[PDB]
């Protein structure tokens, strides 16, 4: 389903990690690029990122695994289901809605908290009814599209 030059684009990203052309990405290469952008992952966080996609077990990401990961993104059945289950954890009503305000409270107070500008952009992207509710099913399908 991917064009021959869209693969060359993902290859350009991959080679930015694998600057020595060994055909693999280790924590070393993944972390060096992340820290060049001003991110600071720990060693354990790098190991977990790589273990999500390493299908062999040697602690690397090779280009076929990279390409599959970039092609799927969030557009898979398991992702839609699990994101839906996350929203439901904060919906005791079960009707399938969450109030704009409760969503803001959960986003800005739990986990890797969103900033005021982030949560404002997210609530703006989801349509709100006359009460203040948002159907997260609609929001989940918009993100996993």
């Amino acid at each position: 389903q991917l064009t021959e030059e869209q693969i060359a684009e993902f290859k350009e990203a991959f080679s930015l990690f694998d600057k020595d052309g060994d055909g693999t990405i280790t924590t070393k290469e993944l972390g060096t690029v992340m820290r060049s952008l001003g991110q600071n992952p720990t060693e354990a966080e790098l190991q977990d990122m790589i273990n999500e996609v390493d299908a062999d077990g040697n602690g690397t990401i090779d280009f076929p695994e990279f390409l599959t990961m970039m092609a799927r993104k969030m557009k898979d059945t398991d992702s839609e289901e699990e994101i839906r289950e996350a929203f439901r954890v904060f919906d005791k009503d079960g009707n399938g809605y969450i109030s704009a305000a409760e969503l803001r409270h959960v986003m800005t107070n739990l986990g890797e908290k969103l900033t005021d500008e982030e949560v404002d952009e997210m609530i703006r992207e989801a349509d709100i009814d006359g009460d203040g509710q948002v159907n997260y099913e609609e929001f989940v399908q918009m993100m996993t599209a």
Partner: protein, 68 residues
């Protein structure tokens, strides 16, 4: 209650990673002359940033699944 409030931080984490992943391709943070130019001369940079957010989304999805 106590077992299903143990889900709340990894659930929040999964939503946040999903939203940050999704925002790579539509956020106002990228709708600047700087990013259009940077994306013209070096398209690989934005793809790399997006590849990192995918990896973090995957990690966050696994951790939320481990609280079931």
């Amino acid at each position: 209650q106590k077992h299903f409030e143990k889900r709340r931080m990894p659930a929040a984490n999964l939503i946040q990673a999903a939203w940050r992943l999704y925002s790579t391709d539509m956020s106002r943070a990228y709708l600047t002359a700087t990013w259009y130019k940077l994306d013209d001369i070096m398209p690989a940079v934005k793809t790399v940033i997006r590849s990192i957010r995918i990896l973090k989304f995957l990690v966050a999805k696994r951790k939320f699944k481990e609280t079931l």
